[PDB]
PDB file of C-alpha atoms and ligand atoms in Angstrom:
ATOM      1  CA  UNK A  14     100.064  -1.553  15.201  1.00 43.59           C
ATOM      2  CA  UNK A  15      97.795  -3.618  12.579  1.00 43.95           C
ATOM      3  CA  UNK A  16      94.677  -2.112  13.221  1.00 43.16           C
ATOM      4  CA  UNK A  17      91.169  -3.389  12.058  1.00 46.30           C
ATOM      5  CA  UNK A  18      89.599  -2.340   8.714  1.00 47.12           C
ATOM      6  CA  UNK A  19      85.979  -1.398   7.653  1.00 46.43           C
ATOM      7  CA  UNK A  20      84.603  -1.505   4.619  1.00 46.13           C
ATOM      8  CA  UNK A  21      80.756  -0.886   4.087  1.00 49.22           C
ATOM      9  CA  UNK A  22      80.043  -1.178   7.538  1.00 51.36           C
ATOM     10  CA  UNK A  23      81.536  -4.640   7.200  1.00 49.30           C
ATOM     11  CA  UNK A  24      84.568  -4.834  10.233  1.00 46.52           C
ATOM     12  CA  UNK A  25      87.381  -7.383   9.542  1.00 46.24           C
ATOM     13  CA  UNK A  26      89.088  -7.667  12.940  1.00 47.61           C
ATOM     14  CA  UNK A  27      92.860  -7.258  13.219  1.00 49.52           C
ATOM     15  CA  UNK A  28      92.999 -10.656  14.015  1.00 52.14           C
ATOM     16  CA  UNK A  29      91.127 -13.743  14.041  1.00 52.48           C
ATOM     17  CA  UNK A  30      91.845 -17.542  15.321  1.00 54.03           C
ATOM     18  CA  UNK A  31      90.177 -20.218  13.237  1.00 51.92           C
ATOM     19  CA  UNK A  32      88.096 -22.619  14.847  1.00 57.15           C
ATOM     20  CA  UNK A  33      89.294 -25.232  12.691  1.00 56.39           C
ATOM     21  CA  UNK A  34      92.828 -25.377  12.331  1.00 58.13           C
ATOM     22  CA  UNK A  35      93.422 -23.250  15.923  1.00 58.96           C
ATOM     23  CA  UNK A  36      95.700 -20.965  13.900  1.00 60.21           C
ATOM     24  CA  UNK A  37      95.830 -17.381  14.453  1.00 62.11           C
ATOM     25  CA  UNK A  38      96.051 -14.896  11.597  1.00 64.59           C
ATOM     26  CA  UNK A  39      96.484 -11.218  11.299  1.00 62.88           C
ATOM     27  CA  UNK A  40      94.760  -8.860   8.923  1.00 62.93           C
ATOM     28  CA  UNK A  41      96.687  -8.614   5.314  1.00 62.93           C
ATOM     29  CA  UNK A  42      94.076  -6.267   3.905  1.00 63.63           C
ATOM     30  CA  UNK A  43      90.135  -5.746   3.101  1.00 62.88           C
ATOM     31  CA  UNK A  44      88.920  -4.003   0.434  1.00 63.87           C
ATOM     32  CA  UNK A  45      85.268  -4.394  -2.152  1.00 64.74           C
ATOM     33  CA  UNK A  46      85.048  -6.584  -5.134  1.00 65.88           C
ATOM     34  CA  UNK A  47      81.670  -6.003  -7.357  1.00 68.93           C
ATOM     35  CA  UNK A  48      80.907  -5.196 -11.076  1.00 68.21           C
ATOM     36  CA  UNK A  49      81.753  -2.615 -13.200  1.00 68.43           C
ATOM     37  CA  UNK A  50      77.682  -1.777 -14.779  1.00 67.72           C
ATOM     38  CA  UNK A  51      78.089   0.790 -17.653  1.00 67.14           C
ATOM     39  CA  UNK A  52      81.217   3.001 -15.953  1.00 67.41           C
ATOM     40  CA  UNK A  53      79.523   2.750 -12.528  1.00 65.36           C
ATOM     41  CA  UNK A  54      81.221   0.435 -10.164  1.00 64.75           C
ATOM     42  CA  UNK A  55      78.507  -1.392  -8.299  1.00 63.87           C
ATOM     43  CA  UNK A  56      80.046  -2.967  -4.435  1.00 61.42           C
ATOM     44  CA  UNK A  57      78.909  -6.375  -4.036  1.00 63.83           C
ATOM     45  CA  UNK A  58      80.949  -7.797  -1.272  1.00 68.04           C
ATOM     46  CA  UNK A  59      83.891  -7.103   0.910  1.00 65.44           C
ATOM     47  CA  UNK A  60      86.996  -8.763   0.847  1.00 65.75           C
ATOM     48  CA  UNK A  61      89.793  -9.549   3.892  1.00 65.40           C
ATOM     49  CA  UNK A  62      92.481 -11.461   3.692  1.00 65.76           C
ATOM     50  CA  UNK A  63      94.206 -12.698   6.410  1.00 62.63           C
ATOM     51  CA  UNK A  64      97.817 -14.304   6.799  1.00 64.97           C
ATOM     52  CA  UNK A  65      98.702 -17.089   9.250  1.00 64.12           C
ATOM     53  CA  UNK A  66     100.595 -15.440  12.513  1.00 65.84           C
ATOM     54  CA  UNK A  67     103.803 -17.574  11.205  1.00 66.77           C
ATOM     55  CA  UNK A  68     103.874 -15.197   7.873  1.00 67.86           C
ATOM     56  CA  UNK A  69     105.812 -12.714   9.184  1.00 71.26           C
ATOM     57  CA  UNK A  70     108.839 -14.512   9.835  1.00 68.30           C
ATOM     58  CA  UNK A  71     108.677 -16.410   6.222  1.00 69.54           C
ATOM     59  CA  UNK A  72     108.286 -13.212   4.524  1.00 70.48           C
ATOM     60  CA  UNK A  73     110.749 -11.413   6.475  1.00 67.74           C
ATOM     61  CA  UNK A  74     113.673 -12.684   4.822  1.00 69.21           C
ATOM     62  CA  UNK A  75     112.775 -11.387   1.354  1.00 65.87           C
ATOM     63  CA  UNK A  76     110.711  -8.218   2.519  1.00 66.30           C
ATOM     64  CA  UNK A  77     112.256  -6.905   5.650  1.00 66.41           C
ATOM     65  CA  UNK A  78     113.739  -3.186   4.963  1.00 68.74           C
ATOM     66  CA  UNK A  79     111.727  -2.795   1.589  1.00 67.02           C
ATOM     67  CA  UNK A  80     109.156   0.508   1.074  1.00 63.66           C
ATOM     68  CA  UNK A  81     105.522  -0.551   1.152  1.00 62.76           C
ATOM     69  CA  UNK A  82     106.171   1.827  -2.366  1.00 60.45           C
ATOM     70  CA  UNK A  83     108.860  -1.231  -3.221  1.00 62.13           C
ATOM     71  CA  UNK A  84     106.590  -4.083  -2.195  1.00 63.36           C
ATOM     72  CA  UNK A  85     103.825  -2.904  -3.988  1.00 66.37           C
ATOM     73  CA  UNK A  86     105.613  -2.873  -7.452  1.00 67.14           C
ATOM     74  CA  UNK A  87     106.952  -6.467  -6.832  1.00 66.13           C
ATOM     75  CA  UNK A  88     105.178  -9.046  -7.718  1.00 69.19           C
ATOM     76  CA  UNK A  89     107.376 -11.514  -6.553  1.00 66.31           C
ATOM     77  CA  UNK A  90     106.024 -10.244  -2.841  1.00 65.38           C
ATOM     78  CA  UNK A  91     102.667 -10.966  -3.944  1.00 65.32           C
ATOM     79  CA  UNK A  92     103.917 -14.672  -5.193  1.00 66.56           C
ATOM     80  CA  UNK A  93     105.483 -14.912  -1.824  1.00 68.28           C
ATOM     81  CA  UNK A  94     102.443 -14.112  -0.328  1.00 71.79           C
ATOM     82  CA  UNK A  95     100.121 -16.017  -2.673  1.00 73.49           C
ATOM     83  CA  UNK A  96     102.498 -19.458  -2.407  1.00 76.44           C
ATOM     84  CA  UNK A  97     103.622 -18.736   0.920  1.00 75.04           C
ATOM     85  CA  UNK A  98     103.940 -21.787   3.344  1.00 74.17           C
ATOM     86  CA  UNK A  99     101.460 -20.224   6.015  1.00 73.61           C
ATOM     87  CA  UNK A 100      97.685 -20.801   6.037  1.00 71.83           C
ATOM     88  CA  UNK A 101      95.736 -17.788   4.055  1.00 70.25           C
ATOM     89  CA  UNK A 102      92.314 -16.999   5.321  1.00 69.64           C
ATOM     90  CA  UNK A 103      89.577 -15.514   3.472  1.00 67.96           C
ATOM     91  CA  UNK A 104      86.477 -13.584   4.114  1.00 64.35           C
ATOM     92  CA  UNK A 105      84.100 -12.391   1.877  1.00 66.11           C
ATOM     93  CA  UNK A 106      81.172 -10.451   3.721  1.00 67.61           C
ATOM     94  CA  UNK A 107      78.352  -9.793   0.975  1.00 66.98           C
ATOM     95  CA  UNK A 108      77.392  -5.818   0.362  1.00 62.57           C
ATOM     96  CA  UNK A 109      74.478  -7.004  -1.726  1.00 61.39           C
ATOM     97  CA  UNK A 110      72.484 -10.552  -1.302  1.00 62.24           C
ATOM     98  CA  UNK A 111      74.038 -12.767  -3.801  1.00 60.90           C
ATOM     99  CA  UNK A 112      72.797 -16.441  -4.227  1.00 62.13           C
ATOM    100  CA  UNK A 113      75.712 -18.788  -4.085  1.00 60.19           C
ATOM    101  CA  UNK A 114      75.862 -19.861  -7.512  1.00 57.93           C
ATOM    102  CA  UNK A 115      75.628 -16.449  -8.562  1.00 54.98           C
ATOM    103  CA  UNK A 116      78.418 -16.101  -6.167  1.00 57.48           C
ATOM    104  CA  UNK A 117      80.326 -18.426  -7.126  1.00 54.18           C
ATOM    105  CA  UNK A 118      80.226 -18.171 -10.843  1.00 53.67           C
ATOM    106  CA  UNK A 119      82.137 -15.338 -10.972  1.00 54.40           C
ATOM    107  CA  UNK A 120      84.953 -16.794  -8.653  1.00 51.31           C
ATOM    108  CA  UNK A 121      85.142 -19.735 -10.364  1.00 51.95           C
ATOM    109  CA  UNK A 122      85.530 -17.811 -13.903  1.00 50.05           C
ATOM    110  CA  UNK A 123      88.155 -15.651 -12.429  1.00 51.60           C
ATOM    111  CA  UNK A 124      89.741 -19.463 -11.066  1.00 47.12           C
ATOM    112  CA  UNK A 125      89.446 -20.951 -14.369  1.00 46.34           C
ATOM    113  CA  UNK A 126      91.517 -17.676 -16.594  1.00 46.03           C
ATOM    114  CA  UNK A 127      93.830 -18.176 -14.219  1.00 44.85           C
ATOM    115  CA  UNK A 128      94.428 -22.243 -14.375  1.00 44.64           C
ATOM    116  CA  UNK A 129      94.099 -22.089 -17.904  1.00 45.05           C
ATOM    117  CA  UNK A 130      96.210 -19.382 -17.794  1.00 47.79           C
ATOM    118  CA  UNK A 131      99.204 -21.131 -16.208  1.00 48.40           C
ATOM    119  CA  UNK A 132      98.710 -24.203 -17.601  1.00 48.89           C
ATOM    120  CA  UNK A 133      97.490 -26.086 -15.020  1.00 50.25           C
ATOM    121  CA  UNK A 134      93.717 -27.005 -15.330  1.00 46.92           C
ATOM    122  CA  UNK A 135      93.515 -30.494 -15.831  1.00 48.59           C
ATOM    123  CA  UNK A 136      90.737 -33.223 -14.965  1.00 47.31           C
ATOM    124  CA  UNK A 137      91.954 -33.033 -11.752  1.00 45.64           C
ATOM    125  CA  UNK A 138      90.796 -29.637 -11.561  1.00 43.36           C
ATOM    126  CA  UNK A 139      87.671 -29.159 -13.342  1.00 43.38           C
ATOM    127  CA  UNK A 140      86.493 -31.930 -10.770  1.00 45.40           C
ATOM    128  CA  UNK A 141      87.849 -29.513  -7.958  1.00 45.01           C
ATOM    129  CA  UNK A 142      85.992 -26.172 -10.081  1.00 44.45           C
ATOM    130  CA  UNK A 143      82.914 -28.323 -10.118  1.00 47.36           C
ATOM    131  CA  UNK A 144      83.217 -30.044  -6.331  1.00 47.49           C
ATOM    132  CA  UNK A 145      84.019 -25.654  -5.678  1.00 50.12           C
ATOM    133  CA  UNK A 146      80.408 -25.047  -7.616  1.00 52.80           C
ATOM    134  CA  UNK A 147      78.495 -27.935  -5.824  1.00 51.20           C
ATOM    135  CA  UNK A 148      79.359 -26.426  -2.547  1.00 48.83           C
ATOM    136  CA  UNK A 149      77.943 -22.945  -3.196  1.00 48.36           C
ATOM    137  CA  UNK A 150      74.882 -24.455  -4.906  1.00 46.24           C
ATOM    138  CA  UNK A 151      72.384 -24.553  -1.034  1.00 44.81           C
ATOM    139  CA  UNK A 152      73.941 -21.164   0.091  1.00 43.47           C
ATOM    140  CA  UNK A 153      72.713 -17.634  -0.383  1.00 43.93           C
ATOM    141  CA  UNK A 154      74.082 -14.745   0.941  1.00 45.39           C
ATOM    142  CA  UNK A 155      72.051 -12.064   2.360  1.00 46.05           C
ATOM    143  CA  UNK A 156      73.568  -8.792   2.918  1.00 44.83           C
ATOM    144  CA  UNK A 157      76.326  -9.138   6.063  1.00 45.10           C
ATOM    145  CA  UNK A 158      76.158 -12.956   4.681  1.00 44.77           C
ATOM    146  CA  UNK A 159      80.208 -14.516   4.239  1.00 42.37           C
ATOM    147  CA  UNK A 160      82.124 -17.391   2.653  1.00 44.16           C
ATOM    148  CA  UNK A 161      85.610 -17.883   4.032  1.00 43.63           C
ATOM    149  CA  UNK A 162      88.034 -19.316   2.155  1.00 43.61           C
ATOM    150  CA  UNK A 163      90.591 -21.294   4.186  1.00 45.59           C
ATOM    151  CA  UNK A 164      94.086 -21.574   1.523  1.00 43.33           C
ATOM    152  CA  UNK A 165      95.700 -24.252   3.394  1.00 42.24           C
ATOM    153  CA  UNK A 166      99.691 -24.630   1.922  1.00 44.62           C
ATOM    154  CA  UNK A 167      99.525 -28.167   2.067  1.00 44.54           C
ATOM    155  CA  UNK A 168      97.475 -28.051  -1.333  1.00 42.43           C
ATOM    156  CA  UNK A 169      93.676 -27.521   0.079  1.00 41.66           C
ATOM    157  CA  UNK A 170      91.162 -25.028  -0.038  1.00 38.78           C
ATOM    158  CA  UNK A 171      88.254 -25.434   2.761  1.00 35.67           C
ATOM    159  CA  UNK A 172      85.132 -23.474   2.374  1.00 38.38           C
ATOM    160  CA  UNK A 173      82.885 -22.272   5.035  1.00 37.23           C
ATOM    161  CA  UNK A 174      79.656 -20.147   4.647  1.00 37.03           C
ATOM    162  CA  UNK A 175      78.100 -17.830   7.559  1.00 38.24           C
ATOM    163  CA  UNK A 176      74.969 -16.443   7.421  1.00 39.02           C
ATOM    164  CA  UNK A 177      76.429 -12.977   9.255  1.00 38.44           C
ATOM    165  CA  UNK A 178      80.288 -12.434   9.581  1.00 35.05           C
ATOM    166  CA  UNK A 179      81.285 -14.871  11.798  1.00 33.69           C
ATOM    167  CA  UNK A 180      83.396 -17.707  11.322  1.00 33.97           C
ATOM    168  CA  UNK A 181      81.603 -21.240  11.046  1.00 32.16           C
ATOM    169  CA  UNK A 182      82.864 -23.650  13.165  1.00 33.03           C
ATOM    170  CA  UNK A 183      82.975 -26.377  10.793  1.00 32.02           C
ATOM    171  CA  UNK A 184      83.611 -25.988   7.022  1.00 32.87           C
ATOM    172  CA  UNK A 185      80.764 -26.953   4.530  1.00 30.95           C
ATOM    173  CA  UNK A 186      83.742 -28.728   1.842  1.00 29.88           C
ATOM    174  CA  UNK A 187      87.533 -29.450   1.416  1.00 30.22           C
ATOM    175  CA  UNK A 188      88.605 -28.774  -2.620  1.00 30.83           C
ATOM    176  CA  UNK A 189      91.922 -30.827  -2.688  1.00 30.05           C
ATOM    177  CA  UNK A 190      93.796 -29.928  -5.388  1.00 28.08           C
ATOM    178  CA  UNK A 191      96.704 -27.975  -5.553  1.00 23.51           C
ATOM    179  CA  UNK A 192      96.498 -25.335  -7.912  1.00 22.97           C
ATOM    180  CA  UNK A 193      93.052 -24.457  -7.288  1.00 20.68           C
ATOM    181  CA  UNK A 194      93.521 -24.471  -3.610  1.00 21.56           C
ATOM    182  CA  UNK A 195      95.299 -21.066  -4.059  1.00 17.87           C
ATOM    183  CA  UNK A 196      93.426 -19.897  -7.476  1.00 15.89           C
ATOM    184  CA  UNK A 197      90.775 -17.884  -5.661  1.00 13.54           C
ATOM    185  CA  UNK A 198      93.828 -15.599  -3.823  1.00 12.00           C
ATOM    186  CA  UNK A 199      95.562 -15.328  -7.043  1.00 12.64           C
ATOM    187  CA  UNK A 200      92.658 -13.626  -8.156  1.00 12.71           C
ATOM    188  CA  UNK A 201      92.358 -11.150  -5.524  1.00  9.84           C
ATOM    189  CA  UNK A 202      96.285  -9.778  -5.564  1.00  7.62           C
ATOM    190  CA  UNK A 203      97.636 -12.131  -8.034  1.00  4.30           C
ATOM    191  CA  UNK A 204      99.214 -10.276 -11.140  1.00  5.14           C
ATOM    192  CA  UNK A 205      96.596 -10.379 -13.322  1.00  7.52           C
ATOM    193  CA  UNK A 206      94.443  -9.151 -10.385  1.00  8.94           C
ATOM    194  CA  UNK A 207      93.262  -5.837 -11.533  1.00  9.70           C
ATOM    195  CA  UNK A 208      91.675  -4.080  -8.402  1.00 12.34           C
ATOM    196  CA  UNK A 209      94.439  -3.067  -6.540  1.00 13.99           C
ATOM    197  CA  UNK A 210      93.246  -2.204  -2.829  1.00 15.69           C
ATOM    198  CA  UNK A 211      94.119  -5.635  -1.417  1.00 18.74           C
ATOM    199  CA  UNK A 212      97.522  -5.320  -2.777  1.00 17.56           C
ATOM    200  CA  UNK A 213      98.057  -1.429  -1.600  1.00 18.80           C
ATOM    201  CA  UNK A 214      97.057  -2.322   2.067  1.00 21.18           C
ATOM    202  CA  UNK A 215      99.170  -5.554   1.785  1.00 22.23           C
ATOM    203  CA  UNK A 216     102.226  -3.469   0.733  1.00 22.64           C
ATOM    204  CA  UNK A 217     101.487  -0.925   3.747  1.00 23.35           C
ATOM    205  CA  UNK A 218     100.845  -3.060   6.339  1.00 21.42           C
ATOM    206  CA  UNK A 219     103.122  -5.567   5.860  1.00 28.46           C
ATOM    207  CA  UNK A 220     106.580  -3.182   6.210  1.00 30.55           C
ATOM    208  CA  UNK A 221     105.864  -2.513   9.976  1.00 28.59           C
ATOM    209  CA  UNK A 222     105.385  -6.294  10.513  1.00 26.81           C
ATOM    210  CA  UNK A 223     108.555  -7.436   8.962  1.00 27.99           C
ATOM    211  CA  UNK A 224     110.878  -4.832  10.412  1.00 29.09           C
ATOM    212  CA  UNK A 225     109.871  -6.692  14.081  1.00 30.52           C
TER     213      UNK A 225
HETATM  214  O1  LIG B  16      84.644 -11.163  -3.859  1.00 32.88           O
HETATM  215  C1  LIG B  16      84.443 -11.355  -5.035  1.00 32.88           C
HETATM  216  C2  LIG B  16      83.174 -10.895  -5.733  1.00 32.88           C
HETATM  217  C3  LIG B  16      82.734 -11.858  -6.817  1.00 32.88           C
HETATM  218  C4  LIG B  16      81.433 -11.388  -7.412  1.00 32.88           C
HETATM  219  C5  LIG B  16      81.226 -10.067  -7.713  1.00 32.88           C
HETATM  220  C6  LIG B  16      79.907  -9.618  -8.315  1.00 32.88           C
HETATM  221  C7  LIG B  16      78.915 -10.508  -8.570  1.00 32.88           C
HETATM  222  O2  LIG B  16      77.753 -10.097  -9.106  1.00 32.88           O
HETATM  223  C8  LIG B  16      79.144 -11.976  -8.237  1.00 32.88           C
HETATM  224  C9  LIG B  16      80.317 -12.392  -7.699  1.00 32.88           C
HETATM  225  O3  LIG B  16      83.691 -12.038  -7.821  1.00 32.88           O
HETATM  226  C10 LIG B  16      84.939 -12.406  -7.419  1.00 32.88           C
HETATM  227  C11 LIG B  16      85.789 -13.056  -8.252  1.00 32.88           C
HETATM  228  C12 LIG B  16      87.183 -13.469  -7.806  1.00 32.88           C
HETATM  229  O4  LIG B  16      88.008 -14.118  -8.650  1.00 32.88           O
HETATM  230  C13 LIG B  16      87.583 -13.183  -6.540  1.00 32.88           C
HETATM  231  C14 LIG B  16      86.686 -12.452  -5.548  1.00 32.88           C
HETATM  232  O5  LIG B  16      87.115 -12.180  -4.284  1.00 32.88           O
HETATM  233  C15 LIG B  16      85.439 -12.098  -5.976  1.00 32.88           C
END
C-alpha cells in the first residue's frame, strides 16, 4: 500500500529502479522546497525521496511497532534513515526554472551549515562542495526540469540532471566524500531541517512497511 505522490503536478512514482546501480527503491516521501519572500512562501521545486527496497528490513528492527506519531518525534529514526546502510535516492523536479548554480547555491549553503555544523568540513570537503558546484554550473532547469541525487552508503553522492522527470541513464559526477555524500538528505529531514513534510510522510508511510 505505498502509493504514488503528487506535488504541483509533479508525480513521484511509488517506486523506481535506477538505471545505474539496478537497485529498486520505494517512495519515502515528496513534498516542495522554495523561499520564504516577505511571509509568502514561494514553491520552487519538488522534492522525493526514495529508500533502497533493502530499507525496510534495516529499519525494521528499531521501528517496527512504533506510531508514525512516535517516529515522527524521533530523531534517531530520521538518523537511521539519513545514515542508513541502503542507497537513498533523490529527486528534485523544478516548480520554477532555476539555473543550476542558482540551484545549487542554496543546496550547497544548506550542505555547508550543516558540515560546519558537525564538525566535519575539511579540505577534503570544500573540494567535494566545489567538485558539487562545478557540476551544476552547464545545467538549467526549466520547469518539470530534475537533479537526482543518488546517496550511495558506501560514502558517495552521484548526481544526475534530466531535462523532464525522468531518470538519466548515466550520472553527470560522483562527489566522494563521506560526509557530504549524505549532507544534501540531512538537509531535507535532518534535525535542523525545518520544513517538515518529508519527515511527516516518512513517519506515515514507513509504519505499514515495517510491520511486514
Ligand atoms: O530542493 C531544494 C530547493 C533549493 C532551492 C530553493 C529556492 C531557490 O531559489 C534555489 C534553490 O534549496 C534547497 C536546499 C537544501 O539544503 C535542500 C533542498 O532539497 C533544496
Amino acid at each position: 500500500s505505498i502509493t504514488a505522490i503528487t506535488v504541483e503536478n509533479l508525480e513521484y512514482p511509488a517506486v523506481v529502479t535506477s538505471p545505474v546501480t539496478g537497485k529498486s527503491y520505494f517512495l519515502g516521501g515528496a513534498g516542495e522546497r522554495g523561499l520564504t519572500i516577505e511571509g509568502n512562501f514561494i514553491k520552487f521545486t519538488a522534492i522525493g525521496v526514495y529508500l533502497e527496497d533493502i530499507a525496510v528490513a534495516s529499519l525494521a528492527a528499531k521501528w517496527k511497532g512504533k506510531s508514525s506519531e512516535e517516529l515522527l518525534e524521533t530523531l534517531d529514526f530520521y538518523r537511521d534513515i539519513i545514515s542508513g546502510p541502503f542507497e537513498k535516492l533523490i529527486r528534485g523536479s523544478k516548480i520554477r526554472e532555476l539555473s543550476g548554480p542558482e540551484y545549487s547555491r542554496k543546496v550547497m549553503e544548506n550542505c555547508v551549515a550543516h558540515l560546519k555544523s558537525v564538525g566535519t568540513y575539511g579540505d577534503a570537503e570544500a573540494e567535494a562542495m566545489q567538485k558539487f558546484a562545478e557540476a551544476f554550473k552547464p545545467v538549467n532547469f526549466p520547469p518539470g526540469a530534475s537533479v537526482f541525487y543518488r546517496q550511495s552508503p558506501d560514502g558517495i553522492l552521484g548526481l544526475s540532471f534530466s531535462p523532464d522527470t525522468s531518470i538519466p541513464e548515466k550520472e553527470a559526477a560522483l562527489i566522494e566524500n563521506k560526509a557530504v555524500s549524505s549532507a544534501v538528505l540531512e538537509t531535507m529531514i535532518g534535525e535542523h531541517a525545518v520544513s517538515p513534510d518529508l519527515k511527516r510522510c516518512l513517519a506515515a508511510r514507513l509504519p505499514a512497511l515495517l510491520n511486514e
